[PDB]
Design a protein around this motif. Structure first.
Motif, PDB file in Angstrom:
ATOM      1  N   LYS A  62      34.343  -7.022  44.146  1.00 58.09           N
ATOM      2  CA  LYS A  62      35.017  -8.072  43.392  1.00 58.09           C
ATOM      3  C   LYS A  62      34.545  -9.473  43.764  1.00 58.09           C
ATOM      4  O   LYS A  62      34.399 -10.334  42.898  1.00 58.09           O
ATOM      5  CB  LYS A  62      36.532  -7.970  43.624  1.00 58.09           C
TER       6      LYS A  62
ATOM      7  N   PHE C  98      27.784   2.815  44.519  1.00 57.31           N
ATOM      8  CA  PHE C  98      27.494   3.556  43.287  1.00 57.31           C
ATOM      9  C   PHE C  98      26.381   2.849  42.476  1.00 57.31           C
ATOM     10  O   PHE C  98      25.465   3.483  41.957  1.00 57.31           O
ATOM     11  CB  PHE C  98      28.764   3.682  42.433  1.00 57.31           C
ATOM     12  N   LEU C 102      22.607   4.198  41.189  1.00 53.92           N
ATOM     13  CA  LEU C 102      22.245   3.967  39.785  1.00 53.92           C
ATOM     14  C   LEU C 102      20.902   3.315  39.656  1.00 53.92           C
ATOM     15  O   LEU C 102      20.038   3.843  38.990  1.00 53.92           O
ATOM     16  CB  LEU C 102      23.324   3.111  39.095  1.00 53.92           C
TER      17      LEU C 102
ATOM     18  N   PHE D  64      24.960   1.507  30.303  1.00 54.73           N
ATOM     19  CA  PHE D  64      24.643   0.427  31.237  1.00 54.73           C
ATOM     20  C   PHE D  64      23.826  -0.688  30.583  1.00 54.73           C
ATOM     21  O   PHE D  64      22.721  -0.423  30.124  1.00 54.73           O
ATOM     22  CB  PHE D  64      23.881   1.015  32.437  1.00 54.73           C
ATOM     23  N   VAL D  94      30.655   6.798  32.697  1.00 58.67           N
ATOM     24  CA  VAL D  94      30.235   5.565  33.353  1.00 58.67           C
ATOM     25  C   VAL D  94      29.978   4.478  32.307  1.00 58.67           C
ATOM     26  O   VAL D  94      29.155   4.660  31.405  1.00 58.67           O
ATOM     27  CB  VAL D  94      28.998   5.800  34.262  1.00 58.67           C
ATOM     28  N   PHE D  96      29.170   0.510  32.606  1.00 62.85           N
ATOM     29  CA  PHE D  96      28.826  -0.451  33.620  1.00 62.85           C
ATOM     30  C   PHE D  96      27.983  -1.583  33.099  1.00 62.85           C
ATOM     31  O   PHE D  96      26.945  -1.347  32.498  1.00 62.85           O
ATOM     32  CB  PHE D  96      28.129   0.306  34.749  1.00 62.85           C
ATOM     33  N   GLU D  97      28.441  -2.821  33.311  1.00 63.78           N
ATOM     34  CA  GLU D  97      27.732  -4.028  32.875  1.00 63.78           C
ATOM     35  C   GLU D  97      27.383  -3.980  31.402  1.00 63.78           C
ATOM     36  O   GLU D  97      26.251  -4.249  30.995  1.00 63.78           O
ATOM     37  CB  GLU D  97      26.510  -4.329  33.760  1.00 63.78           C
ATOM     38  N   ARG D 118      34.305   5.863  35.823  1.00 66.80           N
ATOM     39  CA  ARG D 118      33.958   4.601  36.449  1.00 66.80           C
ATOM     40  C   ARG D 118      33.683   3.587  35.359  1.00 66.80           C
ATOM     41  O   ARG D 118      32.699   3.716  34.645  1.00 66.80           O
ATOM     42  CB  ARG D 118      32.745   4.743  37.353  1.00 66.80           C
ATOM     43  N   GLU D 120      33.328  -0.423  35.121  1.00 69.28           N
ATOM     44  CA  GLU D 120      33.182  -1.559  36.021  1.00 69.28           C
ATOM     45  C   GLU D 120      32.305  -2.683  35.497  1.00 69.28           C
ATOM     46  O   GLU D 120      31.238  -2.410  34.955  1.00 69.28           O
ATOM     47  CB  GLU D 120      32.594  -1.015  37.355  1.00 69.28           C
ATOM     48  N   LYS D 121      32.723  -3.945  35.716  1.00 66.99           N
ATOM     49  CA  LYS D 121      31.932  -5.150  35.404  1.00 66.99           C
ATOM     50  C   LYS D 121      31.581  -5.303  33.939  1.00 66.99           C
ATOM     51  O   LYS D 121      30.434  -5.602  33.594  1.00 66.99           O
ATOM     52  CB  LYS D 121      30.665  -5.235  36.277  1.00 66.99           C
ATOM     53  N   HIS D 144      37.649   4.620  38.974  1.00 64.40           N
ATOM     54  CA  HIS D 144      37.312   3.312  39.499  1.00 64.40           C
ATOM     55  C   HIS D 144      37.134   2.393  38.321  1.00 64.40           C
ATOM     56  O   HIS D 144      36.085   2.371  37.682  1.00 64.40           O
ATOM     57  CB  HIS D 144      36.057   3.398  40.377  1.00 64.40           C
ATOM     58  N   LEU D 147      36.997  -4.983  37.728  1.00 63.19           N
ATOM     59  CA  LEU D 147      36.155  -6.097  37.334  1.00 63.19           C
ATOM     60  C   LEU D 147      35.863  -6.117  35.828  1.00 63.19           C
ATOM     61  O   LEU D 147      34.744  -6.382  35.416  1.00 63.19           O
ATOM     62  CB  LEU D 147      34.875  -6.131  38.195  1.00 63.19           C
TER      63      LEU D 147
END
Ligand SMILES: *[C@@H]1O[C@H](CO[C@@H]2O[C@@H](C)[C@@H](O)[C@@H](O)[C@@H]2O)[C@@H](O)[C@H](O)[C@H]1NC(C)=O
Lengths: 211, 214, 108, 475, 17, 21, 109, 21, 17
Positions: A62, C98, C102, D64, D94, D96-97, D118, D120-121, D144, D147
């Motif tokens: 974070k 993680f 990746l 991603f 997943v 992510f970003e 998951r 995230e972000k 998870h 963010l």
């Protein structure tokens, strides 16, 4: 053992701020310094740590790009820089030596304001009706930056019946208010703003006739 | 991340009472829990390490214990200085995590708010602004709700609220609500109402004025 | 870890920290006879701490284990030189984020 | 026909959307789906892009850094099950970003059979608090989800739309608060009665059949499932595969011929591009389990007679043995896939050491070359070598090549040893101690030489023999 | 020097696919 | 690994290029 | 300085065959030039009938040497210019009442 | 060595700093 | 990346003594 932190820290948005934590009473190099953030009215978040010996760090995902941790073993002082500050509002940051001993806290406030002397306003009537059974008067002080102000009623005495509310930031300036409750058969509000060498003293009289 | 669930988030008790706060771990944390105390000045202090070990200087009325995944902090006989905030923290696994906190407050008799509404002063109007202030004072418990009404219509924009911390003398709470307008907008309307909803009454306490003569 | 103080707190001298790379559960002190020579446990002699008065004297003895493999479980425990021994705790060194598993996968 | 279209293999889509259209006819992805690193894409590229046929992914879904994509509601509107047979670092899903993603919108996702989530972000991502993951995964403890825009005070998640707040989305509890559950402003989260378990239900709340997973078109009918809890065969969900079918990839029933086609001779590509599928306990699987070996004429795993044969695949199809240490690298091998080059100039107790490490080799698929092996007097250390296939040959089409071996007197003892050479020729030059009779015998058995040797010729006879307990006198 | 999210960015500066 | 080549390390602006897909 | 600590395996320091001088130009905290701590089998320092050792500066420290008699330590103090608690230090004399030789054997009482 | 750290290698903009005399 | 004469230059950018 003392972790003695820095701040007040007033910063503009998009800037960076570096908060210190000078350690004393123990061997700096032997322990970890942990940093924790507290968003007021809320809990504690772990930011990450540094090992002053190695300069090794670990962050909370974070806070990875936000916080940067640094130590200066020559002065036994640890730092934390926050970056690209925006609408974070305010938060209090603490460093701690492996949790047994914590520093006192540093408040970081993000605002675009300039130093501004407040407008002090007397608050007395109900309008039309002048009924008894205690009367509550009030002082409204608005549009100031930065904090704090000293609100006093009758230059010190009249400590009973007053409530000074904590200041709220609105549009980059603060407002505060105070009530004073007195008996119906029974006043000045004294305001000081250290950040502007200012005193404004309003005698709160009532809106009405020829008094 | 291990989630630490702290309960209750708030607790009312009196001097000399025995109280317990709990943290439930979402994963087994073994004995790796701290209990932290935060003063009103912000100072954080550790009271317990390794679930049950008392730190040096901590009064013996403080104790830590575990049962299943419940970790408890117990204050055997409350003192006035103990009515502050408490936090558990797990250090069993890589992301160190904290409980949500418990505020310990002094128990008192219920009390209705003393509500007072105030028209803008003519001195503020001279400046071009108009603030309508409402005080909701010396109530207990701390939960309260305020509503503003202009000519009988609920007004939510330009309202700011502030609450004091528990009073040192009578153990009550107070709130102030400020409705800020321009002088022109304030003078477009007649009646201004402040409504306090509190546990002590089924019906709100209603305070209003009309923008007449003064 | 906790500081140890015998009845007459006087002349406190030594701690001993044991750590081995361990799988799960099946670890004991009296394991595969350390005897004299080839050992079954990695051992550290930890100098006794300095008290620094009576109010706040927990200048908790500790140790920095270095030379550990990453993403590895370690059986660990402390003992007071011949009082008290700590329990066997398993501690697993850090592994990859993680995000970082990746990357290495997603980019040749 | 529960999955009417194609079964596609796993895919890895990067840079451009071009290859993405390879999914256009898939009902099922038998593998994973990764979509990543599309920096030039914009919303317009996704406005008219949809894969409504996709119902299920057997492994995991990963997204991603895909720019311009704001929701998955049009891309994968009917994706119902992610089985999680293989995972990405314990995750079946997943996200992510994904800069630009505003909602997930996977409004048909009912079950994640194995693995965690998951997310995230994702800086614009909302409609996360509105999803009850406990309906989709048995354990949410390892999820998870951090963010995202949802972490701050900026998501105005709104489910009600038709009437707004009057009989619309189902509501479930978090800790103590009831929250209406939805994927988007226009799509509710499907919630079935508890009696339905993971099987799903119709819009009227009637349970799908116990062999269904997530959803069905009609209640209590195993031919009307959107996806299967166990196995799939001929438009029907079954608990186990009936004869004569085999369980494949833990979700479908296939016949022998299918398993056989997979198995057959993926010529080279041993290292991630072959496996050679086998039959074991009514499953068609990548390889025989431990303790088993493959009976060749019927693909059937059978238990090993003693220790299992060990196939050693050589790097680049060759290996040079020039020491005891390099020979050791082949210890235990019974089959060599590749070719061997022997270059041994010196050492000690070589015949025993070489026999210990190379004595179990029964077959070599390529060629065998002995060159400048000054130390060797015999090749008998290759005790069990019975076949050289010559599938690969030394330049000049040689499967057996012996050059400049100054002490070589024996190949194998041709009175006992049988060696077969399927393809390729023999090469013998500069073997001064090796009689041409040995070479000629090898030609027979298998289907500058000897110039420094006189090969047996005359016979000496003993004219006298005398024993003592400790002595022997001879003439 | 090079890290985290920046690696992805750094590579795109270079790639330009 | 790329992580090991440029994060727990420092990679040459060319090492970085090479396998750009 | 010379420090012997937690050397469980040692019964003697005689392996330091030629050591005749310790200067103590540097000392262990507490101003010690010779320090012996927690040596569970140490029974001999040097044989003080033969060995001479000089210690120019600094003090001696001896703690937790259970098999080392205080007489050995006291001899060292003389020569150089929780100890023995698990040892009984020589004390009584056993005498041989009988001795018998054979080319390959010896019988004793 | 500095040659070995940044020429027959690649050195971090900070590794580079450190021993600036 | 960094080399030859440039190292001297690179270091001065950083030094600024
Ligand atoms: C969708 O189908 C279209 C028609 O061709 C089919 O797909 C190819 C790949 C073969 O399987 C062939 O036997 C079929 O007739 C194609 O234009 C399109 O590429 C197909 N997309 C997919 C999923 O491959």
């Amino acid at each position: 053992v003392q972790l003695q932190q820095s701040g007040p820290e007033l910063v503009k948005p998009g800037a960076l701020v570096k908060i210190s934590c000078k350690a004393s009473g123990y061997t700096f190099t032997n322990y970890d310094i942990h940093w924790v953030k507290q968003r007021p009215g809320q809990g504690l978040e772990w930011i990450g740590w540094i090992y002053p010996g190695d300069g090794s760090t670990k962050y909370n995902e974070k806070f990875k790009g936000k916080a940067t941790l640094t130590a200066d073993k020559s002065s036994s002082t640890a730092y934390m820089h926050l970056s690209s500050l925006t609408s974070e509002k305010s938060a209090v940051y603490f460093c701690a030596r492996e949790w047994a001993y914590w520093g006192q806290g540093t408040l970081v406030t993000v605002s675009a304001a300039k130093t501004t002397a407040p407008s002090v306003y007397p608050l007395a009537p109900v309008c039309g009706d002048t009924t008894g059974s205690s009367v509550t008067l009030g002082c409204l002080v608005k549009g100031y930056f930065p904090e704090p102000v000293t609100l006093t009623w009758n230059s010190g005495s009249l400590s009973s019946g007053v409530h000074t509310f904590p200041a709220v930031l609105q549009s980059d300036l603060y407002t505060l208010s105070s009530s004073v409750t007195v008996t119906s058969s029974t006043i000045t509000c004294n305001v000081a703003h250290p950040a502007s060498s200012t005193k404004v003293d309003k005698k709160i009289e009532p809106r009405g006739p020829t008094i | 991340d291990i989630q630490m669930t702290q309960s209750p988030s708030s607790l009312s008790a009196s001097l000399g009472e025995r109280v317990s706060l709990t943290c439930r771990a979402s994963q087994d944390i073994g004995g790796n829990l701290y209990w932290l105390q935060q003063g009103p000045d912000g100072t954080i202090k550790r009271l317990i390490y390794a679930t049950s070990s008392l730190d040096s200087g901590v009064p013996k009325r403080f104790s830590g214990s575990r049962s299943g995944s419940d970790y408890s902090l117990t204050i055997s006989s409350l003192e006035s200085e103990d009515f502050v905030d408490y936090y558990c923290l797990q250090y069993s696994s890589s992301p160190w995590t904290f409980g949500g906190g418990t505020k310990l407050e002094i128990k008192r008799a219920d009390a209705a708010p003393t509500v007072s509404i105030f028209p803008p002063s003519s001195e503020q109007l001279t400046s071009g602004g108009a603030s309508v202030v409402c005080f909701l004072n010396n109530f207990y418990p701390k939960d309260i709700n305020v509503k503003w009404k202009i000519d009988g219509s609920e007004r939510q924009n330009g309202v700011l609220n502030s609450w004091t911390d528990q009073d040192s003398k009578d153990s009550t709470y107070s709130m102030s609500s400020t409705l800020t307008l321009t002088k022109d907008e304030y003078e477009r309307h007649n009646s201004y109402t402040c409504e306090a909803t509190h546990k002590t009454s089924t019906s709100p306490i209603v305070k209003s004025f009309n923008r007449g003569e003064c | 870890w906790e500081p140890y103080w015998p009845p007459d707190f006087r002349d406190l001298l030594g701690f001993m920290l044991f750590y081995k790379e361990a799988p799960y559960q099946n670890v004991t002190e009296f394991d595969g006879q350390d005897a004299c020579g080839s050992n079954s446990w990695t051992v550290v002699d930890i100098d006794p701490p300095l008290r620094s008065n009576d109010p706040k004297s927990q200048n908790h003895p500790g140790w920095l284990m270095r030379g550990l493999k990453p993403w590895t479980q370690y059986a660990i425990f402390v003992k007071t030189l011949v009082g008290a021994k700590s329990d066997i705790i398993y501690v697993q060194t850090d592994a990859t984020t993680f995000e970082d598993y990746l990357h290495n996968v997603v980019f040749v | 026909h529960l999955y009417p279209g194609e079964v596609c293999p796993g895919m890895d889509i990067r840079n451009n959307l071009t290859r993405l259209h390879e999914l256009e006819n898939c009902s099922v992805i038998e593998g994973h789906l990764q979509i990543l690193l599309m920096f030039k894409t914009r919303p317009e590229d996704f406005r008219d892009l949809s894969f409504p046929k996709l119902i299920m992914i057997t492994d995991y879904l990963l997204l991603f850094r895909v720019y311009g994509l704001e929701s998955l509601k049009d891309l994968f509107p009917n994706l119902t099950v992610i089985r999680g047979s293989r995972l990405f670092f314990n995750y079946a899903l997943v996200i992510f970003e994904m800069v630009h993603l505003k909602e997930l919108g996977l409004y048909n996702l009912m079950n994640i059979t194995r693995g965690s989530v998951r997310i995230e972000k994702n800086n614009e991502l909302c409609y996360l608090a509105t999803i009850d993951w406990s309906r989709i995964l048995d354990s949410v403890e390892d999820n998870h989800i951090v963010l995202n825009k949802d972490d701050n005070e900026e998501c105005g998640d709104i489910c009600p739309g038709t009437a707004k707040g009057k009989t619309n989305c189902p509501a479930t509890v978090i800790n103590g608060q009831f929250v209406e559950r939805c994927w988007t402003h226009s799509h509710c989260q499907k919630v079935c009665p508890t009696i339905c378990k993971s099987h799903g239900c119709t819009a009227e709340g009637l349970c799908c059949h116990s062999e269904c997973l997530g959803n069905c078109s009609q209640p209590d009918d195993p031919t009307k499932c959107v996806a299967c809890r166990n196995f799939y065969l001929d438009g029907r969900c079954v608990e186990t595969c009936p004869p004569p079918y085999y369980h494949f990839q833990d979700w479908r029933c296939v016949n022998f011929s299918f398993c056989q086609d997979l198995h057959h001779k993926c010529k080279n590509s041993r290292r991630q591009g072959c496996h050679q599928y086998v039959i074991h306990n009514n499953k068609c699987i990548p390889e025989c389990p431990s303790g088993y070996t493959m009976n060749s004429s019927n693909l059937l795993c059978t238990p090993c007679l003693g220790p299992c044969p060990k196939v050693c695949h050589l790097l680049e199809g060759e290996k040079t043995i020039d020491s005891v240490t390099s020979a050791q690298e082949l210890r235990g091998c019974t089959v060599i896939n590749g070719s061997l080059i022997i270059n041994i100039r010196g050492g000690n107790n070589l015949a025993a050491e070489l026999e210990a490490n190379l004595g179990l080799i029964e077959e070599i698929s390529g060629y065998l070359k002995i060159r400048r092996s000054y130390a060797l007097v015999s090749l008998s250390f290759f005790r069990k070598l019975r076949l050289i296939r010559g599938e690969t040959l030394e330049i000049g089409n040689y499967s057996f090549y012996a050059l400049d071996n100054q002490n070589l007197r024996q190949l194998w003892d041709w009175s006992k040893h049988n060696l077969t050479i399927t393809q390729g020729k023999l090469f013998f030059h500069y073997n001064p101690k090796l009689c041409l009779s040995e070479i000629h015998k090898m030609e027979e058995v298998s289907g500058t030489n000897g110039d420094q040797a006189s090969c047996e010729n005359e016979l000496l006879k003993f004219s006298y023999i005398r024993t003592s307990f400790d002595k022997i006198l001879l003439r | 020097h090079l890290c985290g999210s920046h690696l992805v960015e750094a590579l795109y500066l270079v790639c330009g696919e | 690994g790329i992580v090991e080549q440029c994060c727990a390390s420092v990679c040459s602006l060319y090492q970085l290029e090479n396998y750009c897909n």
